[PDB]
Amino acid sequence: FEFAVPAPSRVSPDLARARARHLDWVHAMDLVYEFSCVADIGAYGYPHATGADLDLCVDVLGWTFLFDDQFDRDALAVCAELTDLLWKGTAATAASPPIVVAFSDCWERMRAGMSDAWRRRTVHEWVDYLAGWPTKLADRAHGAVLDPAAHLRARHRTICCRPLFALAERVGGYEVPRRAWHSSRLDGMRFTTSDAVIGMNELHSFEKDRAQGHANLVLSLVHHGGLTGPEAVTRVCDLVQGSIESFLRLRSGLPELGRALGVEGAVLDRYADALSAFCRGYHDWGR
Amino acid sequence: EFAVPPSRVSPDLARARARHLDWVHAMDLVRGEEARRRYEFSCVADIGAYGYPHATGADLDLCVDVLGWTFLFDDQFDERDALAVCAELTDLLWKGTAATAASPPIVVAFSDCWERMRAGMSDAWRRRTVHEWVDYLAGWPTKLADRAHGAVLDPAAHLRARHRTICCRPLFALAERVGGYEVPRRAWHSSRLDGMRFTTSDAVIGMNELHSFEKDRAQHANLVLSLVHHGGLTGPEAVTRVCDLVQGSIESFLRLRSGLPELGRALGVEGAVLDRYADALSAFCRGYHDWGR
């Protein structure tokens, strides 16, 4: 499939070095993959990042995929240790498992140079992402087919888009002002971008999940909506296109948002560009 | 009137009401004969006895205190001081601290409630309840930003923000605390029980939006106003839409409830605790409905 994401196709020119470094990093962290090409996503989602900034993007994205593998009692203990690490400002110890040590390695770089306000809202977003994995284990043990709305609510946590939007600020060199970042206008752009990425992800892994018995949005629409296979696919496609259209309507109101809140328009367009670039990056990599 | 799945009220409400009025006085939240009279006329305290009809004594006192606190917390936003309170409460919850001598009365009062609310509960329960309290706090910077922005939110965006400020999920945790049980971990995180929490929240929001319609219009965002502005509907049409949301939420809640026996078998969970949890969610929705009238 191909959608009209409002951003040109781009890739970072420093992808060769970053990929090679990252494979040494997962080895040094005792985490391991290289053949899945999941590492390259960092260079597609942040096409202007180079050097250490790109390394952080590749490290964080690679970690999420390896964190997901932990679920495919020990994983629940990691969720609790990571939560306390973030809430209480701790760092990994000598008894921490490799997945926790690796995350602390990322978080120390990610939080450096950022304000307390930015750290506060990013910590909350990291913990809300962690909250979705106990749900994954419970639903798998239950064995029931989630209804479409319940599948999307759970996936909005595990997709990990909001922590990665905060990362765009960190590597871009700016912070969206507080009064503007919390507005429903910008939160709607984060939500619509997440819907699009989820829709794309559900269409890419459809055949694999159906053959392995895993959950998928398309299968939930067939089971609960009475739709056929072809109908459920078109339904998910409409979600991606509608989310893109909704994102574009929200963006057209940023000049008035800046005037109302007294915020420089430049930073607002830079933030909107980052969200669009991430969605486009995931689209191209997935294809 | 909606078909919420019986009307009940706690029999110890008389004593609880009198104690609570002294409590808000001691916490320095409501002082003065005039402010106390206006507060006593709103009956917002009594909700604790409607939402938890089986609570008595100290348990009921905690329910009345917490619910009264949320309304008093809401009043301060109707700016820079309010954002500082949200940050202090967040650190208090994340870092396990307690109020100091420089903390404002609204912070001292919350710590007073939280110490009682967390007593006797496991670390796992405290961890997921802390996150829900902080997600509730996260909705108030959005409220102030939207008011300064001045734009009319679309219906879906209004509901996402209200699911934070309505404060239903922290109050569902409170039902466990006063009920004397913790839903086992493997069942509490399931999408089935999370869907029952979500559908119950939708119903409470829908009822709340119709109660505060005139107040929000005379001052703020409201679900009915968003439906008129973005959907092109008229007032009467938008209201029928909100009623359909409440009725549909209850119907979905009832379909999920009938699957709790199978959830218990699959996960090996005692059915009694699951049905008791479902009763608490249903009772809270019924309580707010009856109190609103």
Swiss-Prot record, chain B:
GO terms for molecular function: magnesium ion binding; R-linalool synthase activity; terpene synthase activity. Substrate binds at R162, K215. A motif (NXXXSXXXD motif) lies at residues 208-216. It catalyses: (2E)-geranyl diphosphate + H2O = (R)-linalool + diphosphate; (2E,6E)-farnesyl diphosphate + H2O = (6E)-nerolidol + diphosphate. Mg(2+) 1 binds at D74. Mg(2+) 3 binds at N208, S212, D216. The keyword Protease does not apply. Its EC number is 4.2.3.26. The keyword Metal-binding applies. It comes from the Bacteria. Keywords: Lyase, Magnesium, Metal-binding, Plasmid. Binds 3 Mg(2+) ions per subunit. Its cofactor is Mg(2+). It is an enzyme of class 4 (lyase). InterPro entries: Isoprenoid_synthase_dom_sf (IPR008949), Terpene_cyclase-like_2 (IPR034686). GO terms for biological process: farnesyl diphosphate metabolic process; geranyl diphosphate metabolic process. Mg(2+) 2 binds at D74. A motif (DDXXD motif) lies at residues 74-78. SUPFAM superfamilies: Terpenoid synthases. Homodimer. The Asp-Asp-Xaa-Xaa-Asp (DDXXD) and Asn-Xaa-Xaa-Xaa-Ser-Xaa-Xaa-Xaa-Asp (NSD) motifs are important for the catalytic activity, presumably through binding to Mg(2+). Belongs to the terpene synthase family. In vitro, catalyzes the formation of R-linalool from geranyl diphosphate (GPP). Can also accept farnesyl diphosphate (FPP) as substrate to produce trans-nerolidol. This is R-linalool synthase. The lineage of its organism: Bacteria, Bacillati, Actinomycetota, Actinomycetes, Kitasatosporales.
